[PDB]
Amino acid sequence: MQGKVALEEHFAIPETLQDSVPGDYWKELQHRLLDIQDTRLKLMDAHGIETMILSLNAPAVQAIPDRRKAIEIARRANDVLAEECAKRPDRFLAFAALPLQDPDAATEELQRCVNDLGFVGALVNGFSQEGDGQTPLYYDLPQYRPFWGEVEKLDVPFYLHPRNPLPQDSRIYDGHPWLLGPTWAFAQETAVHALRLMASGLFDEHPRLNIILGHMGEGLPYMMWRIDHRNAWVKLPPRYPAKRRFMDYFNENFHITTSGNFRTQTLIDAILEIGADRILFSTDWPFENIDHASDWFNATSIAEADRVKIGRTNARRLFKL
Amino acid sequence: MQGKVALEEHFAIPETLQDSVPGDYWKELQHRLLDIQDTRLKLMDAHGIETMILSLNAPAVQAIPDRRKAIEIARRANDVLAEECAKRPDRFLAFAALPLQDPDAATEELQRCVNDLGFVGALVNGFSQEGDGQTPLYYDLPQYRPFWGEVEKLDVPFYLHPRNPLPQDSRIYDGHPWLLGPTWAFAQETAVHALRLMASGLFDEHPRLNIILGHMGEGLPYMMWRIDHRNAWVKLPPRYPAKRRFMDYFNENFHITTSGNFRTQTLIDAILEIGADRILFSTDWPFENIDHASDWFNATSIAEADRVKIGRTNARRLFKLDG
Amino acid sequence: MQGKVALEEHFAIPETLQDSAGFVPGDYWKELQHRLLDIQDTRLKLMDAHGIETMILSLNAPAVQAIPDRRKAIEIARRANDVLAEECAKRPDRFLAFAALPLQDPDAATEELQRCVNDLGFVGALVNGFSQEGDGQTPLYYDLPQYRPFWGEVEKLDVPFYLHPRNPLPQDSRIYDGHPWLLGPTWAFAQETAVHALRLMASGLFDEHPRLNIILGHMGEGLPYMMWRIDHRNAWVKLPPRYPAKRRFMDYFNENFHITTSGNFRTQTLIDAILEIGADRILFSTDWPFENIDHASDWFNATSIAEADRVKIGRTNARRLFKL
């Protein structure tokens, strides 16, 4: 399939490189993160990707406790991204990096990126760190409501990307560093953060919000029924502030991508849960090979009509292209 | 379907009853947990369940920090269960409650339950608490290897059941108590505990072990591919002690049940990931209605041959009930 | 789900009533007749109780397609269409109509479709497979040359064509000899309709008229499950197909066809279809009165698909297709 749109495609600036074992693989990953116009573009041309929506790596800004520095790095990453997109505006679009440890500053930067730089959304690596940085700040909190109101006003999607939990909140993984990151920790952290947004009633207040999750929903589709229906015999209204069910907000305010989850069985389950209209192709490059993502997607067992929607038209519609 | 086997069916004793909002629902749940020979049996007769493998509620013994007390309560709960099953041996089987905060005591009690009481396995509610009870004790730790060796020798399954993480290990849920328990926390806690067992190399050392997970695998099937294959271009071997991949241990040493997860889409995904031969019917009664579980299972969209296997024969084979 | 659209819902006129006599055993015949003749009463009450807002009505089978005499066929089609228009006018907010066509006379059929669409406001046509004409001993399929003008008009009017089943003629039914239970909905209906559909595709009809929309009931008459094989059998042979059409069967099926859930309330079948043709081309339907409306609706309300797709398959796909 040609003309695909991919939207969990990362790059980095020297300031955030460290954020992402020594040897040839680490050297290659660094090269990939810094490259946009050469290797990346050639792979897009060879693997049917017309549009790549770029985003800064992780944890990047979300791991910068000093709001002053976080704002600085965010603006810097966004300016660099704007310059890179300008080189091939027919192929590259961008997601804004935001200094959410400072709600007002984040709202202002999103406005600048969207209104002045033409960015089409925001990508944030989970909770923010601020001050001593020992407290994970989730976006369902009160201080972020004004921000969400602006996101809805600008009407651009918010990509809730993973990050690892803080050490004090990672004891279950002690002795197992191999369970951190994309193996598992990333999914748990992101899935719960998403559930917090839903449970808080954020989508009752701002029903037009569009949230995007990668890695096929971080496991949510498979357990969505249970999330709402567990202990069904108990006919008492849910205790959370949100007015409806989790499945309602997931079905109406979320979209998921195939980033780093090239599994047909997983895609089929998602198609039967959230629907093909809300699944988007993505690769997670440079952490995943573009050819791996594309070759899998070209052959996965779905209707050709859905391969076109998931690979291209769903995204073009979502980002008003 | 008649003649089903259900194996995540709970009961409680006064001592552990408290482990399980005020009103009529709370009163009903308590009654259900204390009943075995009446209400429960009538529902089994009405909903095609021939065999029910019983287990104590949660967290129960795993939440008793004092080793002596934990050993006492486990003992009491197992003796009570043994007596209840003896009243109707053709309908009730039992899972042992174990005081794992004391590895040796736990091994001794499992042998006692299996060899002397005829129990067919063990059910443990996640990590154990001991001493000050502020440290979650996972079973992949070195001190539990002798125990696992005995489990394999006795050749009985180990049901790794959920429990909530300790407060200091649940900040991500702060302000959202509705995310604890069956809504989500139970799955994360159990899924990771299972992955720790796999990564530790436990199944290389004891390959004949049979581990059971409820709630359709606590989310594992859907993300299993990613667990091993993420960043596939990096051809460097994983650094965990285990010699093979997570999918290998999941496919070879685990079985999942339908407890509290009556969703056809989820069952189809599991069938295409772990296979119908490793999926077992279960309800999670009394936390779930038996009729809800049975009615869903009778109509779910699978082959009739698989409905027979998942509903009865997989369990009969696993617990050697045909000989 | 409320607000559903159903489009394989039948009725009969006195002149075609007996055609359904063999569909059900005795004792049930009286009830089936009542169902076929009723449009405004029981039918509407079932629609209100089972979340159906719009019902696109069609004459029963084989009806017009089994009338060998051209003059008579044209007469019955016009009468059936006039009656249907009268019935729809009584409850225009709930009933729409498919035209009955005397295709044993191409020109007349073309004229009648135009009348139904332009003057009566019908939204498409429903035809029970091949036509019989003259001695009526030869099945007339619509891929034949004489029907090209007709298809051009269908495309011009831009209304869908529902290719409904009918049993093959006795001389073309020997494989079922001694097994009358295999005729009809059990199996014969599907084979007859599936192949007729393939004949249309292979003939190149959709190369000539790419905007045509064909609808098949009973979840595609078995086509989705075997579609890959239909094109890819003997794939090692790198030679072009031998039929007139320029492309593959899957292309025409994916681009010119839609299938309904009529009389095939099976979740596994629906999942396969979703993974082959896609939810955007699957439509809810019941096959009332040959199938119970409650059976169709209750199954559809609980089938294992995404809620977004339940809305599309149950309502929006049809509203989009019929420009409602």
Place this chain on the structure above:
Amino acid sequence: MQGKVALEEHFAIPETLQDSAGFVPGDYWKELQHRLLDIQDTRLKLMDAHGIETMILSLNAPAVQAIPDRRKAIEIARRANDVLAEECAKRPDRFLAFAALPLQDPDAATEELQRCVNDLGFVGALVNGFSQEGDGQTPLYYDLPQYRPFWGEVEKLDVPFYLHPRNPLPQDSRIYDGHPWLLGPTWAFAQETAVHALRLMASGLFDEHPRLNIILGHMGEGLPYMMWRIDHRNAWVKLPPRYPAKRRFMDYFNENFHITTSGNFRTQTLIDAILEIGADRILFSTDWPFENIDHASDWFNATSIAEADRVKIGRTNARRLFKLD
């Protein structure tokens, strides 16, 4: 996956070679002829390269079923079976055999099956649909009364019967008139075989002989997808079916049939079949030489199913069915 078992793998003898002519034009015909006549060389090299340990061989089609003269049919069947036995003996560790049967003569077919199984060690029979006999203008289906003794012997010998496709006679193919491209594997093969299978079911054959094992290729010739409708159409009518069988079509399909992946390398189709008949009754097969072995193997190695089921469908279901353990 290595160690697979494939069971819809054909060959031909000079006497039946022309039956496969019409299929491919030129050059491809030369290649197909080579493939059909070869058993020990190219075929074996492909098995070694594509993880196939066991290949259960069968004569091509329609072959014996299209020989109306009883004596000639018996002769050709015996000749094909003797050649097959000789070929299998060259490499018994890799090749097994299905018997060709002269069913236009029930007693003769019964005797030949006994000879093949008891004396030649064949593991089953493969028949290309209905038989032609005498004037050959009437399709002879195996649900007919005269074949009951034969079926009783099949059950006694306890070997599977592979009901393979064939095209219907011209007078029974008018629906395909003008569309020769719809005959054969494109569609006609499936319709012919699916209905023949339903006739066996409806006749009550499996009530009388419940231990029979029937095998269908091409993923069941379309049956799984429409199985619910076959039994449940017009469900509101609460009256029993009119056929002689005591139970439902789905019951006989579930209990007496097995389907193979021959010439139907489609994951969606396999998933539907897994959710209808179950992975325990699906078997890997290729339909070589009409289909490429690498096409079948490559698809099966990557299809979206549980690894445990890949092992069963690719090898253990067959080994259990043919008692190879």
